[PDB]
Amino acid sequence: MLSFCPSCNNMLLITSGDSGVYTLACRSCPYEFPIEGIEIYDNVDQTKTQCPNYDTCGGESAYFFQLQIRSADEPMTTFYKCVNCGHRWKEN
Amino acid sequence: VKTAETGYMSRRLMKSLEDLSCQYDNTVRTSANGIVQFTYGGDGLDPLE
Amino acid sequence: VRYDNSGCLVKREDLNKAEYVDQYDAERDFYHSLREYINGKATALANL
Amino acid sequence: LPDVVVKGLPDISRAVINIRDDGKRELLVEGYGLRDVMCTDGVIGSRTTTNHVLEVFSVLGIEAARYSIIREINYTMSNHGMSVDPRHIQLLGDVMTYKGEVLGITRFGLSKMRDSVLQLASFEKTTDHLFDAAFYMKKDAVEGVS
Amino acid sequence: MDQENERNISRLWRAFRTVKEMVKDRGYFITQEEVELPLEDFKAKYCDSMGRPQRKMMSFQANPTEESISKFPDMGSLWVEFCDEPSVGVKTMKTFVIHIQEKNFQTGIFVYQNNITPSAMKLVPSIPPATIETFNEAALVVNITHHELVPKHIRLSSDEKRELLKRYRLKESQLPRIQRADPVALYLGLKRGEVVKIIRKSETSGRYASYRICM
Ligand SMILES: [Zn+2]
């Protein structure tokens, strides 16, 4: 977490406190650190079907797409798109 | 630099295939008289002629 | 001629099938292509 | 933590999607994977190709590997220039493969078939072959040219 | 997960295709409908109504036919069973041996699940009149002989053998060899000293043949 302790100013390492508490203190120097710790580092096509997407939607109209996937004997997978929301959908 | 490298390749490639011939049985055989191939190139015709 | 498998002649059919495949096949195709080449020149005289 | 694999294999260094033939499309992959990416669903594995023939021997083996090694040798040598002819190539790949395993031309791999100690101590070796043949009390014969 | 599970049932289904067409070219008797089925009939047969497939019920039996028992005088029907758990060891292999004991035949073959350990290696290859075979589910998806470069490998009897040696007048062995435990070798289950005729096609004169024995 890369912290430090004023005065001596070396480093702060987490040490296990007795009976339930987790603390941290500077090495070789007396100190105690209370608080919460934190760190962070970083269209023409149309078809007729029922739309599963529901807010007010309940849309009748939809889009579809066709391609052959996986094995030759494996059936066709279709891709549905909705007019109102513009949601992509996929099922075989 | 390429001049010195020229000799090594052909040499080591030779010493493997060095002993081989074609008998009157039309089969190309080795020094141990083991048959590596029944007919040369699957044809038996020489690219020289 | 023809030799089927081991010590047996073939009959009338496998000539086209040719799953037995003895060697000398290079000798047959040479005579074949040579014959059909003359045919191509012969059939050219036909249209002419 | 921000390392470990979520999906895919532990092989490929990278892949590429390229335009195949005239107008068609396909991909080429760099890795040792082979069968696993062939077993990988979504692609037809019937017609494929792979380099470093030795590993092709670990899957298809023998014949198919011999057919592949004469395929690459012919290719790369048909570009830069001249011609080596089809005949001389097939014999090179056959004498390597015929034993049932791909090996040869190197001192570690040149001891496979030949039992002649003098020609092997000729090409490359000095001390070992002379003492080894004496230890095991080998005999062999004087046959070959060298 | 519905997604990845259906990937595996399609795997096993195509894996069932592999072991099927494999038992056919050995000379054993099946039909074109046996190796050819869509996903429909597969889901009915070996998969429950709950949606989860099964294991042990996939086991079947097949025999040879006509020339298979003529060409090769010594042979017969075999018995194939499947595995259960990814962990090997004795377990069901005991009764598997027992199954081979009273039911005789030739070679019990079983497709693995995931891992192999020396436990199951306790005794694999002893049923002294016969033997067995080991196959991994992973390695088996599509057939290798049908793939690209691998040509047709034709196994022949002892008859054709001695005649082939009477052609060029040769002592035995000494021919171009073929290793065993080779994925193609073990595929057809070749024993010691078995010649297999190979028809290969490359372009010079085109089609030509060569012989390779099995060490
Ligand atoms: Zn401090």
UniProtKB/Swiss-Prot annotation, chain A:
The keyword Disulfide bond does not apply. Its main location: nucleus. A zinc finger (TFIIS-type) spans 47-90. Zn(2+) 1 binds at C5, C8, C26, C29. Transmembrane segments: none annotated. CDD domains: Zn-ribbon_RPC11. Keywords: DNA-directed RNA polymerase, Metal-binding, Nucleus, Transcription, Zinc, Zinc-finger. InterPro entries: DNA-dir_RNA_pol-M_15_CS, Rpa12/Rpb9/Rpc10/TFS, Zn_ribbon_RPB9, Zn_ribbon_RPC11_C, Znf_TFIIS. GO terms for cellular component: nucleolus; nucleoplasm; nucleus; RNA polymerase III complex. A zinc finger (C4-type) spans 5-29. GO terms for molecular function: DNA-directed RNA polymerase activity; nucleic acid binding; zinc ion binding. SUPFAM superfamilies: Zinc beta-ribbon. It is found in: Nucleus, Nucleolus. GO terms for biological process: termination of RNA polymerase III transcription; transcription by RNA polymerase III; transcription initiation at RNA polymerase III promoter; tRNA transcription by RNA polymerase III. Zn(2+) 2 binds at C51, C57, C82, C85. Component of the RNA polymerase III (Pol III) complex consisting of 17 subunits. Belongs to the archaeal RpoM/eukaryotic RPA12/RPB9/RPC11 RNA polymerase family. DNA-dependent RNA polymerase catalyzes the transcription of DNA into RNA using the four ribonucleoside triphosphates as substrates. Component of RNA polymerase III which synthesizes small RNAs, such as 5S rRNA and tRNAs. Involved in Pol III transcription reinitiation and RNA cleavage during transcription termination. This is DNA-directed RNA polymerase III subunit RPC10.
UniProtKB/Swiss-Prot annotation, chain B:
DNA-dependent RNA polymerase catalyzes the transcription of DNA into RNA using the four ribonucleoside triphosphates as substrates. Largest and catalytic core component of RNA polymerase III which synthesizes small RNAs, such as 5S rRNA and tRNAs. Forms the polymerase active center together with the second largest subunit. A single-stranded DNA template strand of the promoter is positioned within the central active site cleft of Pol III. It comes from Saccharomyces cerevisiae (strain ATCC 204508 / S288c) (Baker's yeast). The chain holds residues 877 to 925 of 1460 of the full protein. Belongs to the RNA polymerase beta' chain family. Present with 6020 molecules/cell in log phase SD medium. It comes from the Eukaryota. This is DNA-directed RNA polymerase III subunit RPC1. Component of the RNA polymerase III (Pol III) complex consisting of 17 subunits. The gene is RPO31. It is found in: Nucleus.
Curated annotation (Swiss-Prot), chain E:
It is found in: Nucleus. It comes from the Eukaryota. One of its GO terms (molecular function) is DNA-directed RNA polymerase activity. One of its GO terms (cellular component) is RNA polymerase I complex. Keywords: DNA-binding, DNA-directed RNA polymerase, Nucleus, Ribosome biogenesis, Transcription. GO terms for biological process: nucleolar large rRNA transcription by RNA polymerase I; ribosome biogenesis; RNA-templated transcription; termination of RNA polymerase I transcription; termination of RNA polymerase III transcription; transcription by RNA polymerase I; transcription by RNA polymerase II; transcription by RNA polymerase III. Belongs to the archaeal Rpo5/eukaryotic RPB5 RNA polymerase subunit family. Component of the RNA polymerase I (Pol I), RNA polymerase II (Pol II) and RNA polymerase III (Pol III) complexes. Component of the RNA polymerase I (Pol I) complex consisting of 14 subunits: RPA135, RPA190, RPC40, RPA14, RPB5, RPO26, RPA43, RPB8, RPA12, RPB10, RPC19, RPC10, RPA49 and RPA34. The complex is composed of a horseshoe-shaped core containing ten subunits (RPA135, RPA190, RPB5, RPO26, RPB8, RPB10, RPC10, RPA12, RPC19 and RPC40) where RPA135 and RPA190 form the DNA-binding cleft. DNA-dependent RNA polymerases catalyze the transcription of DNA into RNA using the four ribonucleoside triphosphates as substrates. Common component of RNA polymerases I, II and III which synthesize ribosomal RNA precursors, mRNA precursors and many functional non-coding RNAs, and small RNAs, such as 5S rRNA and tRNAs, respectively. Pol II is the central component of the basal RNA polymerase II transcription machinery. RNA polymerase complexes are composed of mobile elements that move relative to each other. PANTHER family: DNA-DIRECTED RNA POLYMERASES I, II, AND III SUBUNIT RPABC1. This is DNA-directed RNA polymerases I, II, and III subunit RPABC1.
